[PDB]
Amino acid sequence: HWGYGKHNGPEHWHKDFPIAKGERQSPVDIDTHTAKYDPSLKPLSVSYDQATSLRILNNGHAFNVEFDDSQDKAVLKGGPLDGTYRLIQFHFHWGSLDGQGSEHTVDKKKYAAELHLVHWNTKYGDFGKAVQQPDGLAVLGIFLKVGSAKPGLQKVVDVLDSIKTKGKSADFTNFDPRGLLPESLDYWTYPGSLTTPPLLECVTWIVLKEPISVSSEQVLKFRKLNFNGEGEPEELMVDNWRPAQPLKNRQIKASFK
Numbered sequence: 190h191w192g193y194g195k196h197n198g199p200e201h202w203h204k205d206f207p208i209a210k211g212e213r214q215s216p217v218d219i220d221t222h223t224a225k226y227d228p229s230l231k232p233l234s235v236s237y238d239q240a241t242s243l244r245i246l247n248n249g250h251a252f253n254v255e256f257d258d259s260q261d262k263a264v265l266k267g268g269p270l271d272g273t274y275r276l277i278q279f280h281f282h283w284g285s286l287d288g289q290g291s292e293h294t295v296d297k298k299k300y301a302a303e304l305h306l307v308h309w310n311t312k313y314g315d316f317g318k319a320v321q322q323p324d325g326l327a328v329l330g331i332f333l334k335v336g337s338a339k340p341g342l343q344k345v346v347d348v349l350d351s352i353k354t355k356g357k358s359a360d361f362t363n364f365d366p367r368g369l370l371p372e373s374l375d376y377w378t379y380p381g382s383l384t385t386p387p388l389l390e391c392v393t394w395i396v397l398k399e400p401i402s403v404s405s406e407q408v409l410k411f412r413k414l415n416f417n418g419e420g421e422p423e424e425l426m427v428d429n430w431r432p433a434q435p436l437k438n439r440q441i442k443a444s445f446k
């Protein structure tokens with residue numbers, strides 16, 4: 190049904206998912222002069238040393254790396270969060286050219302891509318219950334800019350050939366997501382939504398100020414993936430990002446001066 194083409198892309202989504210026009214939709218533009226420093230915000234606590242990755246999957250919209258979230262192995266706490274959030278998957282959004290691809294923007298600046306590390310609030314017992322709650326998910330968003338290669342991304346890049354088309358998956362164990370983080374954990378935060386259907390308004394967004402660098406050759410390999418299934422006409426997976434939505438009655442808070 191929905192996708193990112195001319196006839197089923199973001200401008201059409203509201204017809205099947207009316208919450209598309211809701212009050213806390215993502216992504217948004219981060220105006221750095223209007224964001225408010227909030228000294229009551231705690232530092233982020235990212236505890237990923239015991240992460241267990243299982244599988245990488247092309248789902249027709251992006252590729253997801255999935256984790257075992259049956260226990261508190263890889264968790265996100267602190268920051269604006271109350272309680273413990275478990276890592277369940279990560280994925281990227283990216284562009285057909287280096288000057289677009291991110292979902293969030295900073296002072297209208299687009300980055301080449303954006304990484305989303307998706308976590309769910311354990312107080313709700315399973316992921317399906319969590320997405321129905323206003324504080325059910327926490328997504329950590331990290332910008333990618335093109336420059337020097339990120340060594341810790343290369344294992345992801347090398348496996349992409351094996352999941353070229355929709356519905357394909359491959360074993361992907363022992364991947365350490367700490368290799369994807371920037372040096373600093375300074376962030377902006379605001380309450381928002383999933384950026385794809387079903388567009389539920391269940392996310393605390395935590396967007397890191399410092400981007401990571403990837404090489405042009407790395408991001409080029411993302412662009413060789415396919416939206417379509419095997420045996421269907423080829424449609425390159427590029428520009429799988431939703432444009433910025435109105436901020437409405439929300440304030441973006443910063444953890445840093």
Ligand SMILES: CCN[C@H]1C[C@H](C)S(=O)(=O)c2sc(S(N)(=O)=O)cc21
Pocket residue numbers: 248250278305307320328382383384385386387
């Ligand atoms: C293709 C659907 N993806 C949806 C439904 C998945 C079940 S999810 O894990 O809730 C999730 S997280 C995001 S994002 N872009 O806001 O981080 C989109 C989605």
Ligand SMILES: [Zn+2]
Pocket residue numbers: 280281282305384
């Ligand atoms: Zn995403």
